[PDB]
DNA sequence: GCCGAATATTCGG
DNA sequence: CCGAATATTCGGC
């Protein structure tokens, strides 16, 4: 399992980051709140960059899709589900 | 991909700058003839120069890029009988004073 | 918003 | 030193 997916699983699931990135209440997706602060303050703790665009490129690379005031966004993957970490084994690049 | 109008990869301008910088010459510097550069104390160079220009502090990842762009280690014949107890790299188009040749250095494809 | 491609970083042969 | 896996960046719809 590539490092991006386990890092993404960790930082989404981490309660200490939920004001910036967190599971949706139903758990099929995750929200990103205040993309400016998230990109500069959260991304460099896990990756070699602080660009939201490079984070989104990786999401799309593994097949995540954007879910249709604040600068907030939401992404989903059919196999990126809260509580089901094992599904990551079969998430490959498209 | 790269720019449509003009392309000099970031590694080459960064390499030119950090080699030519007099503030780094105790760690990386041009040879006297200007046709190669030396790396002194690879450990200190990796911690002190590499993170200022790249997303890492690994000598191996710096050398990987050097080889990707066609640079080769310079080796020297050992003369004399006295025992002798620090590396050097060259590219035919990486020459001090012939700065425009840097533009003709292309990365390997893979 | 999503994907192709060149370059960058890491890991193993 | 090299090839590949993965990551980061650049630019096209
Ligand atoms: Na979180
Ligand atoms: Na120097």
Numbering used by the authors:
A (entry chain A): 15 to 82, 93 to 118
B (entry chain B): 8 to 92, 96 to 120
The authors write:
HSFs recognize and bind HSEs through the DBD, which is the most conserved and only structurally characterized domain.
Previous biochemical studies have shown that HSF1 and HSF2 bind to a two-site tail-to-tail HSE with higher affinity than to a head-to-head counterpart (Tateishi et al., 2009), but the structural basis for this difference is not well understood owing to the lack of head-to-head structures. The DNA molecules present in both crystals comprised blunt-ended head-to-head sequences but packed with different orientations in the crystal lattice: head-to-tail versus head-to-head in the HSF2 and HSF1 structures, respectively. All base pairs were well defined in electron density except for an invisible terminal pair present in the HSF1 structure. Similar to the reported structures containing tail-to-tail HSEs, all sequence-specific interactions occur in the major groove and are principally donated by the bidentate hydrogen bonds between an invariant Arg residue (Arg63 in HSF2 or Arg71 in HSF1) and the guanine in the GAA triplet. The dimerization is weakly maintained by contacts between the short turns present in the helix-turn-helix motif, where only one residue (Lys54 in HSF2 and Lys62 in HSF1) is involved in forming a 2-fold symmetric pair of hydrogen bonds. Notably, the wing domain in both DBDs remains unstructured in our structures, but obviously stretched away from the dimer interface to opposite directions.
